[PDB]
Amino acid sequence: DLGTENLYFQSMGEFELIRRFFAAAACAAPAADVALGIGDDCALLAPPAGEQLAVSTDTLVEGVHFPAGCDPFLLAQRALAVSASDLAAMGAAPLAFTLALTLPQADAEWLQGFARGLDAMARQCGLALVGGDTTRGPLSMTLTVFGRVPAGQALTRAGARPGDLLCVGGPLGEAGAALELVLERRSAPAEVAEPLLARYWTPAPQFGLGLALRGKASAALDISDGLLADCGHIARASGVALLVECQRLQASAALSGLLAGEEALRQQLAAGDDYVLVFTLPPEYLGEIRAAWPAMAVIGRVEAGQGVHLLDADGKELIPAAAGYQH
C-alpha cells in the first residue's frame, strides 16, 4: 500500500461524536433479553416465551417538562424515571429503552453529565439502553421504554369495580411542592429541600408495586397529571365512580416541611408528576399489598356510578367554585 487514495470526511462528524456518549454509556452494556443493543438499524429484544412486550413513549420538551439550563445529570434521571413509570403502571418488569435526543449542537460537558445521570437511573431501573436517535434542533428528548409481562397479567385502566378499595402507592403532591423550590419561588432548609427535590428530579418508578399488583389490582395507572385527573381514567375506562376521601390524604413529613393545610392538599390533589400508582383493589388483597408495599395508602373506594368524587370528613362532595378552578 502507498498510503494514498482513502475516503474520509464524508460522514462520522459532529453528531457521531455526540452519539458516542451513549454508545459508550454504562447502561448500553449487554443485558438479559437483549439480543442486539446499540449499533445496528434496530435493537433486537427477546422476552422469554409467553411474555409480552409492554411499550411506552414519553417526550420531555425544554421549558415545558423541565427548566431551561438545568443540571443535565438531574435531567437525564428525571427523563428516564418519568418514562419508566409507565412500565410500573402496567406491572411490567423493566427491560430496555431507546433515547431520541434532539439538541442544538454538541456540548461536551452537558453530554457527559447527561450520560452519567442516564447511567445512574438506568441502573436503578434495571433498564438497558439499546438504541436511539441523535438529531439537531431545540432541546427535546423522547424515551421509549420496554418491559415484559406474562400474557393476561398486565395491569389495565379498566376493571375497577364497585366495592373495590381506591389506593395510592405513596405520598402525593411532593413533586408539586418541589417545583416551588426548583423555580426558587420558595426557600427551605436542606432537611426539607432535599427530600422534595429528589421527588422532582429522581422519582423512583414503582416497579415493585406494579409487580406485586399482578392478578390482584382490578385497575391501575401511574399519577402523572394529578390525583383527581388520573382517577378519571380508571373511572371512565371501568365505567364506575371513584370516591376520594379528603381526610385520607395524609401530607407527608417532606410535604408538610414546606407547605401546610390547603396549599398542601391542593398539591396532593392536582400537582401531578407524582409517578406513584393509583389503583383499585378488591378488599381481600389489602393486607398482602400493604406488606409488599408499606408506603401504599387507602384513599377511598369504588362504587356504581360515574365520575371522580372528592368527599370531605362528613361525606359531602367538594366542588371547585367555578369551572377551571381547583380545590
Nearest distance from residue 176's CB to ligand ANP, in Å? 15
Among a second copy, ligand ANP, Mg ion, none, partner that 19 touches (CB below 5 to 8 angstroms by kind): ligand ANP
Q: Using CB atoms within 10 A of its CB, is residue 155 exposed (0-12), middle (13-18) or buried (19+)?
A: buried
Q: Work out the number of other CB atoms within 10 angstroms of the CB of residue 201.
A: 22
Nearer to ligand ANP, 279 or 285 (CB): 279
Nearest distance from residue 111's CB to ligand ANP, in Å? 10
Signed CA dihedral, 178, 144, 219, 50: sign only = negative
Of residues 17, 26, 32, 61, which one binds a second copy by CB under 8 A?
Answer: 61
Q: State the cell numbers at 143.
A: 424515551
Nearer to a second copy, 133 or 288 (CB): 133
| 310 phi/psi in degrees, rounded to 5 | -90, 125
> Which residues, numbered 60-119, are part of the site for Mg ion (CB under 5 A)?
86, 89
261 lies in the site for a second copy, by CB under 8 A: no
Nearest distance from residue 18's CB to Na ion, in Å? 13
Between CA 107 and CA 111 the distance in angstroms is 6
206 lies in the site for ligand ANP, by CB under 6 A: no
E strand or H helix that includes residue 83: helix 72-89
308 lies in the site for a second copy, by CB under 8 A: yes
The angle formed by the CA atoms of residues 69, 70 and 73, to the nearest 5 degrees, is 130
1 lies in the site for Mg ion, by CB under 5 A: no
276 lies in the site for a second copy, by CB under 8 A: no
Buried b (16+ CB within 10 A) or exposed e, 52-90: bebebebebebeebbeeeebbbbbbbbbbbbbbbbbbbb
Of residues 91, 131, 170, 203, which one binds ligand ANP by CB under 6 A?
Answer: 131
129 lies in the site for ligand ANP, by CB under 6 A: yes
Buried b (16+ CB within 10 A) or exposed e, 161-176: beebbbbbbbbbbbbb
75 lies in the site for a second copy, by CB under 8 A: no
Q: Which residue is nearest to ligand ANP (CB)?
A: 132
Between CA 256 and CA 264 the distance in angstroms is 7
Buried b (16+ CB within 10 A) or exposed e, 248-271: ebebbebbebbbeeeebbbbbbbb
Of residues 149, 209, 271, 299, which one binds a second copy by CB under 8 A?
Answer: 149
Binding stretches for Mg ion (CB under 5 A): 41, 58, 86, 89, 133, 222
Binding-site sequence positions for substrate: 65, 273, 325
Binding-site sequence positions: 41, 56-58, 65, 86, 132-133, 157, 222, 224-225, 273, 325
Binding stretches for ligand ANP (CB under 6 A): 19, 22, 38-40, 58, 86, 99, 101, 129, 131-134, 224-225
Binding stretches for Na ion (CB under 5 A): 41, 56, 58, 86, 133
